[PDB]
Design a protein around this ligand. Structure first.
Ligand SMILES: Cc1cc2nc3c(=O)[nH]c(=O)nc-3n(C[C@H](O)[C@H](O)[C@H](O)COP(=O)(O)OP(=O)(O)OC[C@H]3O[C@@H](n4cnc5c(N)ncnc54)[C@H](O)[C@@H]3O)c2cc1C
Ligand SMILES: Cc1cc2nc3c(=O)[nH]c(=O)nc-3n(C[C@H](O)[C@H](O)[C@H](O)COP(=O)(O)OP(=O)(O)OC[C@H]3O[C@@H](n4cnc5c(N)ncnc54)[C@H](O)[C@@H]3O)c2cc1C
Ligand SMILES: Cc1cc2nc3c(=O)[nH]c(=O)nc-3n(C[C@H](O)[C@H](O)[C@H](O)COP(=O)(O)OP(=O)(O)OC[C@H]3O[C@@H](n4cnc5c(N)ncnc54)[C@H](O)[C@@H]3O)c2cc1C
Ligand SMILES: Cc1ncc(C[n+]2csc(CCOP(=O)(O)OP(=O)(O)O)c2C)c(N)n1
Ligand SMILES: Cc1ncc(C[n+]2csc(CCOP(=O)(O)OP(=O)(O)O)c2C)c(N)n1
Ligand SMILES: Cc1ncc(C[n+]2csc(CCOP(=O)(O)OP(=O)(O)O)c2C)c(N)n1
Ligand SMILES: [Mg+2]
Ligand SMILES: [Mg+2]
Ligand SMILES: [Mg+2]
Lengths: 522, 524, 527
């Protein structure tokens, strides 16, 4: 004998969830009451539910495990929506509990009435209203299983009255963790691919986050066929380290070596990528794509050969079939292009008496941040600088809103990262627009005591792609909130400001006045 | 080489091997019709109601294992597809629907025939998008086709008639690379855990669904190794219920005692590739193990103590060598004995009589006289019960229905698709009188398309599965004759054998209108 | 009152005056069937396809002016209603759809027959909600019924079969108060402005749609006062094209020259209760004034220089005394002359011949021999063209079609609803061969319900309006096999007697008329 809400909480507990992110409301009484009497799952109270969703997404990204957020009826859960798009687009396992108005009032135009079970369809792969307690075991099981195994958001919509009703007595709360299966293409398909590669030249690999966990195989594959690698942004943390074949990125924020290697390839292998910018794929090259998701195949380019498979096990099965190629002209030219490009990048990142080049600031962040720091970066120029200047190493992490493309993601994600890894350094590279767009949750940094290092790229503008922001002193604002604030205006002050911020035993905001820059590198 | 968006679509489908498109025309489909006529390779199959086009395409996809296509004109045209598309999607068969749409310039104004197909079809598809711009078509079509084929379901492309007539992007490619399913099998560690669990479990039953298609050999070997009786969900019947000494029937209301009891009494239950939806028929204190390729199926209709994601064939192949042979066969032997009793009860109901024709007799005789490799379709209603209980399967015969979506009137439309896909093969539609008359207009398609379907109407002059249950008494044989198809009216049990034999021999379509009694479901 | 949710619904409908519910049963409808049986007042009308139940309910609501109801079982059952509900909603007729739903405990699990009707029906309704809890039903049903009747369109109530069987709330009331439409008239200032504008406008035409229903007298008086020819949109035909010396026909592709030119050449155009959707047929150079009760109609298919919200009857009554009589009638006289030419062209196409039966001859003869108060329905396709051009209206006859939603196969199903609603009245369905065969199963409903519909099939063995070839079918033979009289007509000389026979027979009849391919154009009259 327990409530529907208790059944949910116990089942989550069994699946190993550690916390739920949200803001309360009366519609969530059943859930709050369960959490209080359970005393194991921790409630993380944010100032805006949007931030709860972002934070849960960051937690799921880092842990590889189901994360949970919740919102009260109407406006409460509606506030989650932009953060849930980010979670879903980032392919991270997140369950959203959307509390709903009393079921008796549905359809009458009631106080706070919305229809969450319709609103959230696009940003989830499962979304249903629990009208009856008898639904909860099936609805919760499918929701959790899809969130974890399909890697995305599931939404359970729970009227507050239904939450307080008795759960079905025979229902079980134990959760069996089923890992991903091994997914690899048919042997014949691998043989066909190997044969194709045998007779292809000037091959480049475009690698995305689907290569996570396959570093060793990827590097061995590139070396075997002599293929330079370019990586999509979400592949950066997984691909751009211990990798003599990596030659950068394309797209507008990429650089010349990535751009040319991609354009000039005669054969292109897309490995676990969704890189969306169609005009950056070459016009006449064979294109081969390997992905676990049929929906990704052909999404942003023609495809001459498609294979469904997980990158790690596909490459393991493929490697022994692939003959080593001696011809390395294309690779050598790409590497030479890369050397030139990096040098161009580096020339932009120097100290000056004029104004602080944000690329200098980003470079120094990378230089002084921990060996295993977790970085988040706001959509806007901070994404450009992170892409171009953060050095990855297989331990560091980079989170952003790279697919959904939302401003204001950095600090909220940092919040989730820091709570998930309390001992780890977390550095939020924020825009002034981004930081102020969800500024209220700066107070969460204090309230939750999460030592997040916030660095604001204060260009007092909405700089990426004019439209001015009033000269704001964020350091002063931090101090007023009870967090250490450091105002940086001279390039010579940068090094010491970052070192101080990182050493302080607590959260810090470094407010750096930076120059407006350009995207292209001459 | 300039070409229209519609031509680009048609060429791409041609390259993917599509042979026909099912629909009814309209002006909003001019682009498409024009290019099908120019191309002269994909055949246009014109039905009387677009709902039937969708059912038929689903039957084609079910039988061929390959992408099938249907189309509808703007507004009401494509809207007519919807019930059939639910059936396709629920049956997990690869179908592309081209929904022609009003001219894009009139969208949002309350125009003649305005609907929003890109919203309507969300639920019965895994991909559904409006093509506003010619520049979309290569990506939209690629994703639509790839998802339909590999995710096994319906994709919808909504195409305003004016956009269809615009130039396709010049660099777009129309060649289609056929990517087969991957091999999907659980990690080794998980298989060893399962093997260990089975080693310490007793009284194991297997509940097998259509996910076992292609895995017959492994399934039977597995059951024999651990001594587990098999019960099958309805959509597993054609794949599981033959050359199988472990099979003990079905549960659910249309199942029977042996299936019922074996399921209820098991201490360990292994769900293999099944979505069997009737929650109260799963046992209450059993360990439940479920193997499925689709995370959404896991735990959908029962608790799950151990879940594994994997394809049945490849999972059982990897699992078998890890599983120790069990000597204890009491549970299996008792299930088999139950089964012997149940099958005798079933047989007692299927006898000729002077009173009235027992539909179960009729079904039994259909099974007896139909070809070794006949394709059967059956209407939702009593014909589904009789098919389930009396059609003998053998690894060549096929059974199609609307088993998940549960729509009346599916049998003849599916038969239409089956017959066109396999022109040399015998196709037998087991129809209800409600079902047949609900989409009766496409009976004319049987003549127009010259598809020798054998239609057998279970004429109980009622909506018998379930006020408004009485249908005015109707002679469907007479209606057939008036349409130019042979009609045989059967009212005495003694006439059944010869009526079926004549129908099956006739070189053309035939409707056999059999007056059958009302029957109870339970069996004494 | 101890009763179930379904019983509460049935009693409330009974109190609102509903006489019948159209549908096909299913187990998910047990609660409702149960209640209807026990009540014995509302009649269940069983069709062969639920799509037909929806069309038929729409026809009933169109003719009676009152709430009509249809129902469907869970999943495929109610899903089958959808195309007919689009027609109802687009025709602005009050219809409640009861969509039975799977047991609420199975929702979200991928259950047998699972759909989400509360999402599917959003576009073709102005109210659509799931009843999860018995406590909802009084509010949900009250809003559903009120919106259907007063907003004139479809409301959908989605009702899981288990919830249907639960107790209704004990204090709920089942009595229904009928609230009529309010009087809606523009503010006096706006009428004054309009009158002033008309005073200084010339060459004025009126484009009149079904919003003019009930305003014939005022409309004709208004046109005469300012000397404005009237053209009518198709759905205005039955309301406007009779006892009207100002009416000069229709535009659009199926309209004719006089309508076309009057519309194109006007310097001032007044849209009265119309949604005429074909944008290119509005004049490019004229002042446009639109009066409508629905803000969503204003400017939907043309620019608008002056807009007024009001009901046509009230608005014209308040406007007339403000409007000065105009002496200048050149524009009107020219339109009337154009009209005389156009009707003559129309008439020349409607002659008997030994070659083949011109469908326009067939339509003309239907109009000539049908009752003076017949109800006509016509399939989307050529029958709509012929009805538009050849049916003579008179203020008693009615014309139903699928004119906005534009669905094939509407004619016979609408005829079914019309005949049941008016059992003593002659109902003539002008069907296409495509239309008739597309929902042919419900031909059996004509027998089962014993509705004496007169079906006339324009058998051109093609999908003629717009892969169009249909195998030669003999529908008369099919009728006979179904137990209905069938008359096969192949010579023009046989038409007159075939129609007279069909209309006299005390029962339903199908007249299968082999007709020729035609064109929309009408050759000009001497100039
Ligand atoms: C302001 C801004 C500018 C940007 N500009 C650029 C730019 O110039 N260049 C750039 O590159 N990015 C840019 N982006 C980021 C860009 O939008 C995309 O987010 C990114 O390029 C996609 O990276 P990915 O392909 O790894 O994406 P993901 O979305 O992470 O794709 C993962 C892919 O791998 C597949 N996959 C996952 N797991 C496996 C597996 N085990 N085996 C096989 N396949 C698997 C998935 O199905 C999916 O297709 C920008 C972002 C922002 C905010
Ligand atoms: C009137 C009527 C009465 C009915 N009553 C009954 C009844 O009493 N009993 C009954 O059993 N049915 C009954 N049904 C049918 C029932 O509703 C379901 O259709 C049926 O039980 C489900 O069968 P299944 O599990 O094969 O379904 P499917 O939907 O075919 O299930 C397939 C499952 O296998 C998975 N899968 C697919 N491919 C693979 C693979 N390669 N490897 C691993 N997994 C895979 C899928 O993800 C899915 O979960 C009735 C139907 C009707 C119309
Ligand atoms: C094959 C085919 C071809 C067609 N071609 C043509 C054609 O060539 N020409 C043609 O005219 N039609 C044609 N149509 C029909 C056409 O599509 C439109 O449905 C029709 O023109 C609309 O007529 P209406 O304005 O009366 O429409 P309705 O939809 O009946 O619009 C009524 C309008 O009045 C408003 N209203 C209602 N009540 C009141 C009131 N009391 N006071 C004020 N306003 C009120 C409503 O809000 C609405 O704006 C065709 C149909 C078909 C099937
Ligand atoms: C919520 C949201 N609003 C608007 C945009 C459009 N947009 C993208 S980048 C950007 C500028 C971001 O400003 P800031 O955070 O200050 O970053 P900057 O580029 O200035 O460094 C805007 C307005 C967006 N991506 N998301
Ligand atoms: C489109 C549709 N309408 C209604 C139902 C509910 N229903 C299920 S079986 C049935 C009666 C079936 O009639 P018939 O085709 O004659 O089969 P039988 O009478 O032999 O059971 C009905 C009305 C349904 N499943 N699908
Ligand atoms: C359900 C539906 N499908 C398709 C269309 C497109 N369409 C419009 S008219 C027509 C021809 C109708 O054929 P028929 O009923 O025989 O009429 P006619 O031949 O007299 O034009 C078609 C197929 C439609 N409007 N509605
Ligand atoms: Mg900025
Ligand atoms: Mg029957
Ligand atoms: Mg025709």
């Amino acid at each position: 004998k327990q409530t529907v809400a208790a059944y949910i909480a116990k089942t989550l507990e069994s699946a190993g969830v550690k916390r739920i992110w949200g803001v309360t409301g009366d519609s969530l009484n059943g859930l709050s009451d369960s959490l209080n009497r359970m005393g194991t799952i921790e409630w993380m109270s944010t100032r805006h539910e949007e931030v709860a969703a972002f934070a849960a997404g960051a937690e799921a990204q880092l842990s590889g495990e189901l994360a949970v957020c919740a919102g009260s009826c109407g406006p409460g859960n509606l506030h989650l929506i932009n953060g849930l798009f980010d979670c879903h687009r980032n392919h991270v396992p997140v369950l959203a509990i959307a509390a709903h108005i009393p079921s008796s009032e549905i359809g009458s135009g009631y106080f706070q009435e919305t229809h969450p079970q319709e609103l959230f369809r696009e940003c989830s792969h499962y979304c249903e209203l629990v009208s009856s307690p008898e639904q909860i075991p099936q609805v919760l099981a499918i929701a959790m299983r899809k969130a974890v195994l399909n890697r995305g958001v599931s939404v359970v919509v729970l009227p507050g009255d239904v939450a307080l009703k008795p759960a079905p007595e025979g229902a079980t709360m134990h959760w069996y963790h089923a890992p991903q299966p091994v997914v690899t293409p048919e042997e014949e398909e691998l043989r066909k691919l190997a044969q194709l590669l045998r007779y292809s030249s000037n091959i480049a690999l475009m690698c995305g986050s689907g290569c996570a966990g396959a570093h060793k195989e990827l590097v061995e594959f590139a070396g075997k066929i002599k293929a330079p690698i370019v990586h999509a942004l979400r592949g950066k943390e997984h691909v751009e380290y211990d990798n003599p074949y990596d030659v950068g990125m394309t797209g507008l924020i990429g650089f010349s070596s990535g751009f040319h290697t991609m354009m000039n390839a005669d054969t292109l292998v897309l490995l676990g990528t969704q890189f969306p910018y169609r005009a950056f794929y070459p016009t006449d090259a064979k294109i081969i794509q390997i992905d676990i998701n049929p929906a990704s195949i052909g999404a942003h380019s023609k495809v001459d050969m498609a294979l469904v498979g997980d990158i790690k096990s596909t490459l393991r099965a493929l490697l022994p079939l692939v003959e080593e190629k001696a011809d390395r002209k294309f690779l050598d030219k790409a590497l030479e292009d890369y050397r030139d490009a990096r040098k161009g990048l580096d020339d932009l990142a120097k100290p000056s008496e004029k104004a602080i080049h944000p690329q200098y600031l980003a470079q120094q962040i990378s230089h002084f941040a921990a060996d295993d720091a977790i970085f988040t970066c706001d959509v806007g120029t901070p994404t450009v600088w992170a892409a171009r200047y953060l050095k990855m190493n297989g331990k560091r992490r980079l989170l952003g809103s790279f697919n959904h493309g939302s401003m204001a993601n950095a600090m909220p994600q940092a919040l989730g990262a820091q709570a998930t890894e309390p001992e780890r350094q977390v550095v939020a590279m924020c825009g002034d627009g981004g930081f102020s767009m969800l500024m209220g949750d700066f107070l969460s940094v204090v309230q939750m005591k999460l030592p997040v290092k916030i660095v604001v790229f204060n260009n007092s503008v909405l700089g990426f792609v004019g439209t001015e922001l009033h000269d704001t002193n964020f350091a002063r604002i931090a101090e007023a909130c009870g967090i250490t604030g450091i105002r940086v205006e001279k390039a010579s002050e940068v090094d010491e400001a970052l070192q101080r911020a990182f050493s302080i035993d607590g959260p810090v905001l470094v407010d750096v006045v930076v120059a407006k820059e350009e995207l292209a590198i001459p």
